């Protein structure tokens, strides 16, 4: 289970409010108590997420009062001003090309938020004469290293992503590179000066491998991948302030069952798959467990329902036959899978190009030899055909939104690890400054469909969250697929 809450020190783009939020975040991150999952500052907002079992709401709040209200750096960014919108920005604002460039360089900027995508800074304040809205319609792809402005803010796109900000140039330094000893050039609270320069365009950051090329205990060979097979652990914690998603298993209880059935710790690395599973061959005798939904395991002609462990002899090929309800299954192996963690976790952050899905020819290994007796089983709770999701008030609570959400059935339009898009009764939404995304938040834009945010959600978002899915019902959304009916209750 995961819970969270928001502290706010003032509205809008305010230096004092941000200073306060940052003082607490930095003190927490410097010495995080067990049970703290995240401490994310953005503008005057601080979002804390915690595990109730290890850290009570009351105990966390008392720590925050004990911490000091004061903080305990100026980064130069070379920019080539070759942005595609440079002429348009100039003409629209009645400025020359050179005035735009000089105006962009004048301020000493401050980082008010970081991580819309990993390492992506939102900086302020842009000079009054250079303030222009974002484009009426966003580009589907802004290139890596684009330096851009919108209103009082300027930003650097660390990787290619959608965006409607006005592109003025190209950063000649990469703000995010996961292969680098210091992957994030900028931190919350940093100060920034842009300067016109020329030099090589930084390459796009390359994906970071988390699986060893030569495992110490080779265990299985991927004959054929499923749709998206991911090696996950319990998740990546204390990285939302950098834009790193929580990740981990989308149906956590199922992953925990799989691990426990083979005598592993709940968050030992294991395989998650969905819709179509992989075809795997054992390279040594293994004890494995399959949990979750959407499949029956197939081994040596025999079918294996989810919720039990089994002997997996060397040379034998395991498969997964689709069988509703559900879509997402978990394969654990006794000893866990060997992984090379990044910032405390072996879970993938596909947005950040940390990790990747399995490929044909991949070899996975055991972390250690920990033999356990096969044939353990535990009854899985039933997975209903239609979901009933309990709602809690969200940070942008509105009575009308809440009523709309509980007014009648919705249907899943789209579902993945980032979130679940809903089609159903109209729900009023909103947009403002980005604030940190809460796990299970029901995001509703001014016009558009509600999106329930899951483990691979971006760290920051501007759209209103009038409701949160009860943490006890989050596992159901890890088993969602298009067409599934959903009812919300309060």
CSV table of C-alpha atoms in Angstrom, one decimal:
chain,number,residue,atom,x,y,z
A,1,UNK,CA,0.0,0.0,0.0
A,2,UNK,CA,1.0,3.6,-0.7
A,3,UNK,CA,-0.5,6.8,0.7
A,4,UNK,CA,0.4,10.5,0.3
A,5,UNK,CA,-0.4,14.2,0.9
A,6,UNK,CA,0.4,17.7,-0.2
A,7,UNK,CA,2.0,20.6,1.6
A,8,UNK,CA,1.6,24.1,-0.1
A,9,UNK,CA,3.6,27.2,0.8
A,10,UNK,CA,2.0,29.7,-1.7
A,11,UNK,CA,0.4,29.8,-5.1
A,12,UNK,CA,1.9,30.5,-8.6
A,13,UNK,CA,5.6,30.9,-9.4
A,14,UNK,CA,6.8,32.2,-6.1
A,15,UNK,CA,10.5,32.2,-5.0
A,16,UNK,CA,9.7,32.2,-1.2
A,17,UNK,CA,7.1,29.4,-1.5
A,18,UNK,CA,9.5,27.3,-3.5
A,19,UNK,CA,12.3,28.0,-1.0
A,20,UNK,CA,10.1,26.6,1.8
A,21,UNK,CA,9.0,23.5,-0.1
A,22,UNK,CA,12.6,22.8,-1.1
A,23,UNK,CA,14.0,23.2,2.4
A,24,UNK,CA,11.8,20.3,3.6
A,25,UNK,CA,12.3,18.2,0.5
A,26,UNK,CA,16.1,18.5,0.7
A,27,UNK,CA,16.2,17.8,4.5
A,28,UNK,CA,14.0,14.7,4.0
A,29,UNK,CA,16.0,13.4,0.9
A,30,UNK,CA,19.3,14.0,2.8
A,31,UNK,CA,18.2,11.6,5.6
A,32,UNK,CA,15.0,9.7,4.6
A,33,UNK,CA,13.1,7.7,7.3
A,34,UNK,CA,12.2,4.2,6.4
A,35,UNK,CA,8.7,4.3,4.8
A,36,UNK,CA,9.3,7.5,2.9
A,37,UNK,CA,8.7,6.7,-0.8
A,38,UNK,CA,9.0,10.2,-2.3
A,39,UNK,CA,9.5,13.9,-1.4
A,40,UNK,CA,8.7,16.0,-4.5
A,41,UNK,CA,8.9,19.8,-4.7
A,42,UNK,CA,7.4,21.8,-7.5
A,43,UNK,CA,6.9,25.6,-7.2
A,44,UNK,CA,5.3,26.1,-3.7
A,45,UNK,CA,4.1,22.5,-3.5
A,46,UNK,CA,5.6,19.6,-1.6
A,47,UNK,CA,4.2,16.1,-2.2
A,48,UNK,CA,5.1,13.3,0.2
A,49,UNK,CA,4.3,9.6,-0.4
A,50,UNK,CA,4.8,7.0,2.3
A,51,UNK,CA,4.2,3.4,3.3
A,52,UNK,CA,1.7,3.3,6.3
A,53,UNK,CA,3.0,0.0,7.6
A,54,UNK,CA,6.6,1.3,8.1
A,55,UNK,CA,5.8,5.1,8.6
A,56,UNK,CA,2.6,6.5,10.1
A,57,UNK,CA,1.0,9.7,8.8
A,58,UNK,CA,1.3,11.1,12.3
A,59,UNK,CA,5.0,10.3,12.7
A,60,UNK,CA,5.9,11.7,9.3
A,61,UNK,CA,4.1,15.0,9.9
A,62,UNK,CA,6.0,15.5,13.2
A,63,UNK,CA,9.4,15.0,11.5
A,64,UNK,CA,8.5,17.9,9.0
A,65,UNK,CA,8.0,20.3,11.9
A,66,UNK,CA,11.4,19.3,13.4
A,67,UNK,CA,13.3,20.0,10.2
A,68,UNK,CA,14.6,23.5,9.6
A,69,UNK,CA,13.0,26.1,7.2
A,70,UNK,CA,16.3,27.2,5.6
A,71,UNK,CA,18.4,25.6,2.8
A,72,UNK,CA,21.9,24.4,3.4
A,73,UNK,CA,24.5,26.8,-7.3
A,74,UNK,CA,24.7,28.6,-10.7
A,75,UNK,CA,24.8,26.3,-13.7
A,76,UNK,CA,25.8,27.7,-17.1
A,77,UNK,CA,23.9,26.4,-20.1
A,78,UNK,CA,25.5,26.9,-23.5
A,79,UNK,CA,22.8,27.4,-26.2
A,80,UNK,CA,22.9,27.5,-30.0
A,81,UNK,CA,19.9,29.7,-30.9
A,82,UNK,CA,18.8,27.7,-33.9
A,83,UNK,CA,15.2,27.1,-32.7
A,84,UNK,CA,12.5,26.5,-35.2
A,85,UNK,CA,10.2,29.1,-33.5
A,86,UNK,CA,12.8,31.8,-33.2
A,87,UNK,CA,11.5,33.9,-36.1
A,88,UNK,CA,7.9,33.3,-35.0
A,89,UNK,CA,8.5,34.3,-31.4
A,90,UNK,CA,10.4,37.5,-32.6
A,91,UNK,CA,7.7,38.6,-35.0
A,92,UNK,CA,4.8,37.8,-32.7
A,93,UNK,CA,6.4,39.9,-29.9
A,94,UNK,CA,7.6,42.7,-32.1
A,95,UNK,CA,11.3,41.9,-31.4
A,96,UNK,CA,14.3,41.3,-33.5
A,97,UNK,CA,16.0,37.9,-33.6
A,98,UNK,CA,18.9,39.2,-31.5
A,99,UNK,CA,16.6,40.9,-28.9
A,100,UNK,CA,14.9,37.5,-28.4
A,101,UNK,CA,18.3,35.8,-27.9
A,102,UNK,CA,19.6,38.6,-25.6
A,103,UNK,CA,16.3,38.7,-23.6
A,104,UNK,CA,16.5,34.9,-23.0
A,105,UNK,CA,20.0,35.2,-21.7
A,106,UNK,CA,19.4,38.2,-19.4
A,107,UNK,CA,17.9,36.7,-16.3
A,108,UNK,CA,19.5,34.5,-13.6
A,109,UNK,CA,16.9,31.8,-13.7
A,110,UNK,CA,15.8,29.4,-10.9
A,111,UNK,CA,14.7,25.8,-11.2
A,112,UNK,CA,11.1,25.7,-9.8
A,113,UNK,CA,10.4,22.1,-10.8
A,114,UNK,CA,12.3,19.2,-12.3
A,115,UNK,CA,11.2,16.0,-14.0
A,116,UNK,CA,8.1,16.4,-16.3
A,117,UNK,CA,10.3,14.0,-18.1
A,118,UNK,CA,13.5,12.8,-16.3
A,119,UNK,CA,15.8,15.8,-15.8
A,120,UNK,CA,13.5,18.3,-17.5
A,121,UNK,CA,13.9,21.7,-15.7
A,122,UNK,CA,11.1,24.3,-15.5
A,123,UNK,CA,12.8,27.7,-14.9
A,124,UNK,CA,11.6,31.2,-14.2
A,125,UNK,CA,11.5,34.1,-14.7
A,126,UNK,CA,11.5,34.9,-18.4
A,127,UNK,CA,11.8,38.7,-19.2
A,128,UNK,CA,8.4,40.4,-19.6
A,129,UNK,CA,9.0,41.3,-23.3
A,130,UNK,CA,9.8,37.6,-24.1
A,131,UNK,CA,6.6,36.2,-22.5
A,132,UNK,CA,4.5,34.4,-25.1
A,133,UNK,CA,1.9,31.7,-24.5
A,134,UNK,CA,2.6,28.0,-25.5
A,135,UNK,CA,1.5,27.1,-29.0
A,136,UNK,CA,-2.3,26.6,-29.5
A,137,UNK,CA,-1.5,23.0,-30.5
A,138,UNK,CA,1.5,21.0,-29.2
A,139,UNK,CA,4.1,19.3,-31.5
A,140,UNK,CA,3.9,15.5,-31.1
A,141,UNK,CA,7.8,15.4,-31.0
A,142,UNK,CA,10.1,18.2,-29.7
A,143,UNK,CA,13.7,17.1,-30.3
A,144,UNK,CA,16.2,16.3,-27.5
A,145,UNK,CA,18.0,19.3,-26.0
A,146,UNK,CA,15.4,21.9,-27.2
A,147,UNK,CA,15.5,25.2,-25.3
A,148,UNK,CA,12.0,26.6,-25.1
A,149,UNK,CA,9.8,29.3,-23.5
A,150,UNK,CA,6.2,29.6,-22.5
A,151,UNK,CA,4.9,32.5,-20.5
A,152,UNK,CA,7.1,33.3,-17.5
A,153,UNK,CA,8.9,29.9,-17.9
A,154,UNK,CA,11.7,28.5,-19.9
A,155,UNK,CA,12.7,24.8,-20.1
A,156,UNK,CA,15.1,22.3,-21.6
A,157,UNK,CA,13.7,19.0,-23.2
A,158,UNK,CA,16.2,16.4,-22.1
A,159,UNK,CA,14.8,13.7,-24.5
A,160,UNK,CA,12.3,13.8,-27.3
A,161,UNK,CA,8.7,14.3,-26.1
A,162,UNK,CA,5.5,16.1,-27.0
A,163,UNK,CA,5.4,19.8,-26.3
A,164,UNK,CA,3.8,23.1,-27.2
A,165,UNK,CA,6.5,25.4,-25.8
A,166,UNK,CA,8.2,27.9,-28.2
A,167,UNK,CA,11.5,26.5,-29.4
A,168,UNK,CA,14.4,29.1,-29.3
A,169,UNK,CA,17.5,26.9,-29.6
A,170,UNK,CA,19.5,23.8,-28.7
A,171,UNK,CA,21.3,23.1,-25.4
A,172,UNK,CA,25.0,22.2,-26.1
A,173,UNK,CA,25.1,20.2,-22.9
A,174,UNK,CA,22.8,17.1,-22.1
A,175,UNK,CA,20.8,17.8,-19.0
A,176,UNK,CA,20.0,14.1,-18.6
A,177,UNK,CA,22.3,11.1,-19.3
A,178,UNK,CA,21.7,7.9,-17.4
A,179,UNK,CA,25.2,6.6,-18.3
A,180,UNK,CA,26.8,9.5,-16.6
A,181,UNK,CA,28.2,9.5,-13.1
A,182,UNK,CA,26.0,12.5,-12.4
A,183,UNK,CA,23.0,11.7,-14.6
A,184,UNK,CA,21.1,14.9,-13.8
A,185,UNK,CA,22.9,18.2,-14.6
A,186,UNK,CA,20.3,20.2,-12.7
A,187,UNK,CA,18.7,19.8,-9.3
A,188,UNK,CA,15.6,21.5,-7.7
A,189,UNK,CA,16.6,25.0,-6.5
A,190,UNK,CA,19.6,25.4,-8.9
A,191,UNK,CA,20.2,28.7,-10.6
A,192,UNK,CA,20.7,28.9,-14.3
A,193,UNK,CA,22.3,31.3,-16.8
A,194,UNK,CA,21.9,30.7,-20.6
A,195,UNK,CA,24.7,31.9,-22.9
A,196,UNK,CA,24.9,31.9,-26.7
A,197,UNK,CA,27.4,29.4,-27.9
A,198,UNK,CA,28.4,27.0,-30.7
A,199,UNK,CA,29.6,23.4,-30.5
A,200,UNK,CA,28.4,19.9,-31.2
A,201,UNK,CA,24.8,19.0,-30.6
A,202,UNK,CA,24.7,16.5,-27.7
A,203,UNK,CA,23.6,13.0,-28.8
A,204,UNK,CA,20.3,11.6,-27.6
A,205,UNK,CA,20.9,9.7,-24.4
A,206,UNK,CA,21.2,6.0,-25.1
A,207,UNK,CA,19.2,3.4,-23.1
A,208,UNK,CA,20.7,2.1,-19.9
A,209,UNK,CA,21.0,-1.7,-19.5
A,210,UNK,CA,19.9,-3.1,-16.1
A,211,UNK,CA,20.5,-6.8,-16.9
A,212,UNK,CA,24.0,-8.3,-16.8
A,213,UNK,CA,25.5,-9.4,-20.1
A,214,UNK,CA,27.1,-12.3,-18.3
A,215,UNK,CA,25.0,-13.5,-15.3
A,216,UNK,CA,26.9,-15.4,-12.6
A,217,UNK,CA,24.1,-18.1,-12.5
A,218,UNK,CA,22.4,-18.3,-15.9
A,219,UNK,CA,18.9,-19.5,-15.3
A,220,UNK,CA,16.7,-18.9,-18.4
A,221,UNK,CA,16.8,-18.2,-22.1
A,222,UNK,CA,14.1,-16.0,-23.8
A,223,UNK,CA,13.1,-18.0,-26.8
A,224,UNK,CA,10.4,-15.4,-27.8
A,225,UNK,CA,9.2,-12.3,-26.1
A,226,UNK,CA,5.7,-11.4,-25.1
A,227,UNK,CA,4.1,-8.0,-25.9
A,228,UNK,CA,6.1,-6.2,-23.1
A,229,UNK,CA,8.0,-8.4,-20.7
A,230,UNK,CA,9.6,-6.3,-17.9
A,231,UNK,CA,12.0,-7.3,-15.1
A,232,UNK,CA,10.7,-5.4,-12.1
A,233,UNK,CA,11.5,-5.2,-8.4
A,234,UNK,CA,9.4,-3.4,-5.7
A,235,UNK,CA,10.0,-0.1,-7.5
A,236,UNK,CA,12.3,3.0,-7.7
A,237,UNK,CA,11.8,5.2,-4.6
A,238,UNK,CA,13.0,8.7,-3.7
A,239,UNK,CA,13.4,9.8,-7.3
A,240,UNK,CA,10.2,11.6,-8.2
A,241,UNK,CA,12.0,14.9,-7.6
A,242,UNK,CA,14.2,14.0,-10.6
A,243,UNK,CA,11.3,12.9,-12.8
A,244,UNK,CA,11.9,9.1,-12.3
A,245,UNK,CA,8.7,7.1,-12.1
A,246,UNK,CA,7.9,4.7,-9.2
A,247,UNK,CA,7.6,1.8,-11.7
A,248,UNK,CA,7.6,-1.7,-10.1
A,249,UNK,CA,4.8,-4.2,-10.6
A,250,UNK,CA,1.4,-2.9,-11.8
A,251,UNK,CA,-0.3,-5.6,-9.8
A,252,UNK,CA,1.9,-5.5,-6.6
A,253,UNK,CA,0.0,-8.1,-4.6
A,254,UNK,CA,0.4,-10.6,-7.4
A,255,UNK,CA,4.1,-9.9,-7.7
A,256,UNK,CA,4.5,-10.3,-4.0
A,257,UNK,CA,2.7,-13.6,-4.0
A,258,UNK,CA,4.9,-15.0,-6.8
A,259,UNK,CA,8.0,-14.1,-4.9
A,260,UNK,CA,6.8,-15.4,-1.5
A,261,UNK,CA,5.8,-18.7,-3.2
A,262,UNK,CA,9.5,-19.4,-4.0
A,263,UNK,CA,10.9,-18.0,-0.6
A,264,UNK,CA,12.0,-14.7,-2.0
A,265,UNK,CA,11.6,-11.2,-0.4
A,266,UNK,CA,8.5,-9.5,-1.6
A,267,UNK,CA,10.4,-7.2,-3.9
A,268,UNK,CA,13.1,-9.5,-5.3
A,269,UNK,CA,13.4,-8.9,-9.1
A,270,UNK,CA,10.9,-11.0,-11.1
A,271,UNK,CA,9.3,-11.0,-14.6
A,272,UNK,CA,6.1,-9.1,-15.3
A,273,UNK,CA,4.2,-9.8,-18.6
A,274,UNK,CA,0.9,-8.8,-20.1
A,275,UNK,CA,-1.5,-9.9,-22.9
A,276,UNK,CA,1.0,-12.2,-24.6
A,277,UNK,CA,3.7,-13.8,-22.3
A,278,UNK,CA,7.2,-14.9,-23.3
A,279,UNK,CA,8.4,-18.4,-24.3
A,280,UNK,CA,11.2,-19.3,-21.8
A,281,UNK,CA,13.6,-22.3,-21.6
A,282,UNK,CA,15.3,-23.2,-18.3
A,283,UNK,CA,19.2,-23.4,-18.4
A,284,UNK,CA,19.3,-25.2,-15.0
A,285,UNK,CA,16.8,-26.8,-12.7
A,286,UNK,CA,14.7,-24.1,-11.1
A,287,UNK,CA,11.8,-23.6,-8.7
A,288,UNK,CA,9.5,-21.0,-10.1
A,289,UNK,CA,6.1,-19.5,-9.2
A,290,UNK,CA,3.4,-18.0,-11.5
A,291,UNK,CA,0.9,-15.5,-10.0
A,292,UNK,CA,-1.5,-12.9,-11.3
A,293,UNK,CA,-4.2,-13.2,-13.9
A,294,UNK,CA,-4.8,-13.5,-17.7
A,295,UNK,CA,-2.9,-16.8,-18.2
A,296,UNK,CA,-2.4,-20.4,-17.4
A,297,UNK,CA,1.2,-21.6,-17.4
A,298,UNK,CA,2.2,-24.4,-19.7
A,299,UNK,CA,5.0,-26.8,-18.9
A,300,UNK,CA,5.7,-30.3,-20.3
A,301,UNK,CA,2.1,-30.4,-21.5
A,302,UNK,CA,0.7,-29.7,-18.0
A,303,UNK,CA,-1.3,-26.6,-17.1
A,304,UNK,CA,-0.4,-24.6,-14.0
A,305,UNK,CA,-3.0,-22.1,-12.6
A,306,UNK,CA,-1.6,-18.9,-11.1
A,307,UNK,CA,-0.9,-18.9,-7.3
A,308,UNK,CA,1.5,-21.8,-7.1
A,309,UNK,CA,5.2,-22.8,-7.4
A,310,UNK,CA,6.6,-25.7,-9.5
A,311,UNK,CA,9.8,-27.5,-10.5
A,312,UNK,CA,11.1,-26.2,-13.8
A,313,UNK,CA,13.6,-28.8,-15.1
A,314,UNK,CA,16.7,-27.9,-17.1
A,315,UNK,CA,16.0,-27.9,-20.9
A,316,UNK,CA,12.2,-27.5,-20.6
A,317,UNK,CA,10.3,-24.7,-22.2
A,318,UNK,CA,7.7,-22.7,-20.2
A,319,UNK,CA,4.8,-20.9,-22.0
A,320,UNK,CA,1.7,-18.9,-20.9
A,321,UNK,CA,-1.7,-19.6,-22.5
A,322,UNK,CA,-4.0,-16.6,-22.4
A,323,UNK,CA,-7.1,-17.2,-20.2
A,324,UNK,CA,-9.3,-14.4,-18.9
A,325,UNK,CA,-10.1,-12.5,-16.8
A,326,UNK,CA,-7.1,-10.2,-16.3
A,327,UNK,CA,-4.0,-9.5,-18.5
A,328,UNK,CA,-1.0,-9.3,-16.3
A,329,UNK,CA,1.1,-12.2,-14.9
A,330,UNK,CA,4.3,-12.6,-12.8
A,331,UNK,CA,7.0,-15.2,-13.0
A,332,UNK,CA,9.3,-15.4,-9.9
A,333,UNK,CA,12.3,-17.8,-9.5
A,334,UNK,CA,13.8,-19.1,-6.3
A,335,UNK,CA,16.7,-16.8,-5.5
A,336,UNK,CA,15.5,-13.8,-7.5
A,337,UNK,CA,16.8,-12.5,-10.8
A,338,UNK,CA,20.3,-10.9,-11.0
A,339,UNK,CA,20.0,-7.2,-11.9
A,340,UNK,CA,22.2,-4.1,-12.1
A,341,UNK,CA,20.2,-1.5,-10.2
A,342,UNK,CA,20.0,2.2,-11.1
A,343,UNK,CA,19.5,4.7,-8.3
A,344,UNK,CA,18.4,2.0,-5.9
A,345,UNK,CA,16.2,-0.1,-8.2
A,346,UNK,CA,16.2,-2.6,-11.1
A,347,UNK,CA,12.8,-1.6,-12.3
A,348,UNK,CA,12.6,0.0,-15.8
A,349,UNK,CA,11.8,3.7,-16.5
A,350,UNK,CA,11.0,3.5,-20.2
A,351,UNK,CA,10.3,7.2,-20.4
A,352,UNK,CA,13.9,7.7,-19.0
A,353,UNK,CA,15.4,5.0,-21.2
A,354,UNK,CA,16.3,3.0,-18.1
A,355,UNK,CA,15.8,-0.7,-18.8
A,356,UNK,CA,13.9,-2.3,-21.7
A,357,UNK,CA,11.5,-5.1,-22.5
A,358,UNK,CA,12.9,-8.6,-22.9
A,359,UNK,CA,14.2,-9.6,-26.4
A,360,UNK,CA,14.6,-13.0,-28.0
A,361,UNK,CA,18.1,-14.3,-27.1
A,362,UNK,CA,18.1,-12.6,-23.6
A,363,UNK,CA,19.6,-14.7,-20.8
A,364,UNK,CA,18.5,-14.1,-17.2
A,365,UNK,CA,20.3,-15.4,-14.2
A,366,UNK,CA,19.7,-16.1,-10.5
A,367,UNK,CA,20.9,-13.5,-7.9
A,368,UNK,CA,21.8,-16.5,-5.6
A,369,UNK,CA,21.1,-20.2,-5.1
A,370,UNK,CA,18.3,-20.4,-2.6
A,371,UNK,CA,16.6,-23.8,-3.0
A,372,UNK,CA,13.0,-24.1,-1.8
A,373,UNK,CA,10.6,-27.0,-2.0
A,374,UNK,CA,8.2,-26.7,-5.0
A,375,UNK,CA,4.4,-27.1,-4.9
A,376,UNK,CA,3.5,-24.2,-2.7
A,377,UNK,CA,0.1,-22.6,-3.3
A,378,UNK,CA,-2.0,-19.8,-2.0
A,379,UNK,CA,-5.5,-18.9,-3.1
A,380,UNK,CA,-5.7,-15.8,-5.2
A,381,UNK,CA,-8.6,-13.4,-4.7
A,382,UNK,CA,-11.1,-13.4,-7.5
A,383,UNK,CA,-10.8,-10.9,-10.3
A,384,UNK,CA,-14.2,-9.6,-11.2
A,385,UNK,CA,-15.3,-8.9,-14.8
A,386,UNK,CA,-16.4,-5.4,-13.9
A,387,UNK,CA,-14.3,-3.2,-11.5
A,388,UNK,CA,-15.7,-1.3,-8.5
A,389,UNK,CA,-13.2,1.4,-7.6
A,390,UNK,CA,-13.6,3.4,-4.4
A,391,UNK,CA,-12.7,7.1,-4.7
A,392,UNK,CA,-11.1,9.5,-2.3
A,393,UNK,CA,-11.0,13.3,-2.5
A,394,UNK,CA,-8.1,14.5,-4.7
A,395,UNK,CA,-5.9,17.7,-4.4
A,396,UNK,CA,-8.3,19.5,-6.8
A,397,UNK,CA,-11.4,18.1,-5.3
A,398,UNK,CA,-14.7,19.4,-6.8
A,399,UNK,CA,-18.1,18.1,-5.9
A,400,UNK,CA,-19.4,18.2,-9.4
A,401,UNK,CA,-16.4,16.1,-10.7
A,402,UNK,CA,-16.9,13.6,-7.8
A,403,UNK,CA,-20.6,13.3,-8.6
A,404,UNK,CA,-19.9,12.9,-12.3
A,405,UNK,CA,-17.4,10.1,-11.6
A,406,UNK,CA,-19.9,8.2,-9.5
A,407,UNK,CA,-22.9,9.0,-11.8
A,408,UNK,CA,-22.7,5.9,-14.0
A,409,UNK,CA,-20.5,3.2,-15.6
A,410,UNK,CA,-17.3,4.1,-17.4
A,411,UNK,CA,-15.4,1.9,-19.8
A,412,UNK,CA,-11.6,1.5,-20.3
A,413,UNK,CA,-10.6,3.1,-23.6
A,414,UNK,CA,-6.9,2.5,-23.2
A,415,UNK,CA,-4.7,0.8,-20.5
A,416,UNK,CA,-1.0,0.5,-19.9
A,417,UNK,CA,1.5,1.0,-17.1
A,418,UNK,CA,1.3,4.8,-17.3
A,419,UNK,CA,-2.5,4.9,-16.8
A,420,UNK,CA,-6.0,3.9,-17.7
A,421,UNK,CA,-8.1,6.2,-19.9
A,422,UNK,CA,-11.8,6.3,-19.3
A,423,UNK,CA,-14.8,6.8,-21.6
A,424,UNK,CA,-18.1,7.6,-19.8
A,425,UNK,CA,-20.0,10.5,-18.4
A,426,UNK,CA,-18.5,14.0,-18.9
A,427,UNK,CA,-16.3,15.0,-15.9
A,428,UNK,CA,-15.3,18.6,-15.4
A,429,UNK,CA,-11.5,19.1,-15.3
A,430,UNK,CA,-8.9,21.8,-15.2
A,431,UNK,CA,-5.3,22.8,-15.8
A,432,UNK,CA,-2.8,24.9,-13.8
A,433,UNK,CA,0.9,24.8,-12.9
A,434,UNK,CA,2.4,21.3,-12.8
A,435,UNK,CA,2.4,19.6,-9.4
A,436,UNK,CA,3.5,16.2,-8.4
A,437,UNK,CA,1.3,13.3,-9.6
A,438,UNK,CA,-0.2,11.1,-6.8
A,439,UNK,CA,-0.4,7.3,-7.4
A,440,UNK,CA,-3.9,6.5,-8.5
A,441,UNK,CA,-4.9,10.1,-9.1
A,442,UNK,CA,-7.9,10.6,-11.4
A,443,UNK,CA,-6.5,13.2,-13.8
A,444,UNK,CA,-9.2,15.2,-15.7
A,445,UNK,CA,-8.1,17.9,-18.3
A,446,UNK,CA,-10.3,20.9,-19.2
A,447,UNK,CA,-11.5,18.9,-22.2
A,448,UNK,CA,-10.7,15.2,-22.6
A,449,UNK,CA,-11.1,11.9,-20.9
A,450,UNK,CA,-10.2,11.1,-17.3
A,451,UNK,CA,-6.9,9.2,-16.9
A,452,UNK,CA,-6.2,7.2,-13.7
A,453,UNK,CA,-2.4,7.5,-13.1
A,454,UNK,CA,-0.4,4.3,-12.4
A,455,UNK,CA,3.2,3.3,-11.6
A,456,UNK,CA,4.8,4.6,-14.9
A,457,UNK,CA,3.0,8.0,-14.7
A,458,UNK,CA,5.2,11.1,-15.2
A,459,UNK,CA,6.3,12.7,-12.0
A,460,UNK,CA,4.6,16.0,-12.7
A,461,UNK,CA,1.3,17.1,-14.3
A,462,UNK,CA,-0.8,20.2,-14.7
A,463,UNK,CA,-4.2,18.6,-15.1
A,464,UNK,CA,-6.7,18.6,-12.2
A,465,UNK,CA,-7.0,15.6,-10.0
A,466,UNK,CA,-10.5,15.9,-8.3
A,467,UNK,CA,-10.3,12.3,-7.0
A,468,UNK,CA,-7.9,9.5,-6.1
A,469,UNK,CA,-8.5,5.8,-6.5
A,470,UNK,CA,-8.4,4.1,-3.1
A,471,UNK,CA,-5.0,2.5,-2.7
A,472,UNK,CA,-6.7,-0.8,-1.8
A,473,UNK,CA,-8.3,-0.9,-5.4
A,474,UNK,CA,-5.1,0.1,-7.3
A,475,UNK,CA,-4.2,-3.6,-8.1
A,476,UNK,CA,-7.4,-3.9,-10.2
A,477,UNK,CA,-6.2,-1.2,-12.6
A,478,UNK,CA,-3.0,-3.3,-13.1
A,479,UNK,CA,-5.4,-5.9,-14.6
A,480,UNK,CA,-7.4,-3.4,-16.7
A,481,UNK,CA,-7.8,-3.7,-20.5
A,482,UNK,CA,-9.9,-1.9,-23.1
A,483,UNK,CA,-13.6,-2.6,-22.8
A,484,UNK,CA,-13.6,-3.4,-19.1
A,485,UNK,CA,-16.5,-1.7,-17.3
A,486,UNK,CA,-15.7,0.5,-14.2
A,487,UNK,CA,-18.0,2.0,-11.5
A,488,UNK,CA,-16.7,4.6,-9.1
A,489,UNK,CA,-18.1,4.7,-5.5
A,490,UNK,CA,-17.6,7.1,-2.6
